[PDB]
């Protein structure tokens, strides 16, 4: 009843109980149940989309709303990436020139050939 | 000292069956390779 996908199924039931689905994980665990692990009593009606609301269903978390948690996730990622990218600008320059190698950058030793020394060959 | 459950024989029927089959197959393989080395063709061929 509550969720859009359960509402979508309402024309497709004929003479089956339109149950309001409640996540079985959120049923408080101190009541007694015929199957304690599944928190279900015998002959309890099942919602049409039950398989999305039983205990085996993916866990749901109640602390933040889903939309709010999305805001937090995207916010952390954006602030981290943006702070790093802007930090790239305010960077000190090094002090020693990059190292170099004999024989025009050892272009012979990393394969290479006389006709192609740009593909293979170090800073020389 | 932990407790002690009832005795059970080491070699069960399944141990015998599977070990016997596997070992017989390996022995057969070695016999064919040797019989190749001597006869110049494997006994199965």
């Amino acid at each position: 009843i509550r969720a859009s996908f359960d509402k979508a199924e309402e024309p497709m039931l004929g003479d089956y109980p339109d149950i309001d689905p409640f996540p079985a994980q959120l049923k408080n665990p101190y009541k007694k149940y015929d199957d304690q692990q599944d928190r279900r009593n015998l002959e309890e009606p099942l919602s049409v989309n039950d398989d999305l609301y039983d205990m085996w269903s993916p866990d749901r978390f109640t602390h933040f709303k889903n939309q709010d948690a999305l805001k937090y996730f995207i916010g952390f990622l954006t602030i981290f990436f943006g702070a790093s990218y802007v930090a790239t600008y305010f960077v000190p320059e090094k002090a020693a020139i990059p190292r170099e190698f004999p024989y025009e950058g050892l272009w012979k030793e990393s394969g290479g050939t006389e006709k192609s020394k740009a593909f293979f060959g170090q800073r020389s | 000292g932990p407790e002690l459950t009832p005795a059970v024989p080491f070699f069960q029927p399944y141990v015998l069956k599977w070990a016997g089959v596997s070992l017989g197959l390996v022995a057969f393989y070695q016999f064919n390779s040797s019989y190749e080395a001597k006869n110049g063709h494997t006994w199965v061929e």
Partner: protein, 246 residues
């Protein structure tokens, strides 16, 4: 590679000592807020977990030092100009690490008892089968890094034969180019922040145990695996199950 090898040892020691601490409690609770003070009750587990933590915080003369510090420094020594940001990120991560290591240490051994009396009566060490491997991993997590630093971090070492592009190789630059500030700052910060966390916990608990709504919100975000697990379970997994139903 060298950090992987060094980290394996003291990480296993952390986990094993944690298992001993849990096993010492009748409730077998794992919550850090319910352990209280066990330093008198469990000295050997305390020393093992302490060695493991100090190796992890890269304290001088320990195995974690010869891995973690030099990895932190290679970022500054990297030829790519942009990696200097990575230096500060990793540095923050290191002092961050000292924070939670000290939090666990204090809340397990240094804080006032939080569990009921019968547990502290019955709190006792574990058997020989648990103790011996902790001892062995302790000698490893103290000595292995020093005895092996030459093999993996050597000036000219040919043991691992990976063919590094000469342009990319910078392990000399990261040692010669480093300054006293950058080569000392992680160690000094680690020692200070450890002491700071301990003294703040023992003397000014309010600053940790405030009640601000905004700070409680950010703490809640961080506590739930950075609210990522929420994002996955709702937006990927649950949406996929819905689409499968469709």
């Amino acid at each position: 590679l060298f950090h992987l090898l060094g980290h394996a040892f003291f990480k296993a020691l952390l986990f094993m000592s944690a298992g001993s601490i849990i096993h010492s409690i009748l409730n077998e609770s794992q919550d850090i807020r319910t352990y209280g003070g066990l330093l008198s009750y469990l000295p050997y587990t305390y020393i093992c977990i302490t060695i493991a933590s100090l190796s992890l915080m890269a304290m001088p003369g320990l195995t974690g030092y010869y891995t973690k510090d030099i990895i932190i420094e290679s970022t500054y020594g990297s030829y790519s100009i942009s990696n200097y940001v990575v230096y500060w990120i990793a540095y923050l991560s290191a002092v961050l690490t000292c924070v939670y290591s000290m939090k666990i240490l204090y809340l397990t051994f240094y804080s006032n008892p939080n569990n009921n009396t019968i547990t502290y009566y019955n709190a006792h060490e574990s058997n020989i089968y648990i103790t011996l491997p902790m001892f062995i991993l302790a000698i490893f997590a103290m000595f292995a890094g020093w005895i092996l630093k030459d093999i993996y971090l050597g000036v000219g070492t040919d043991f691992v034969g990976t063919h590094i592009l000469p342009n990319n190789f910078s392990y000399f630059d990261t040692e010669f180019s480093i300054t006293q500030f950058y080569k000392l700052l992680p160690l000094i910060s680690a020692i200070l922040v450890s002491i700071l966390i301990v003294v703040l916990n023992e003397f000014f608990a309010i600053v940790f145990n405030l009640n601000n709504k905004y700070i409680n919100t950010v703490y809640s975000i961080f506590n739930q695996k950075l609210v990522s697990d929420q994002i996955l379970n709702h937006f990927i997994i649950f949406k996929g199950l819905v689409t499968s139903g469709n």
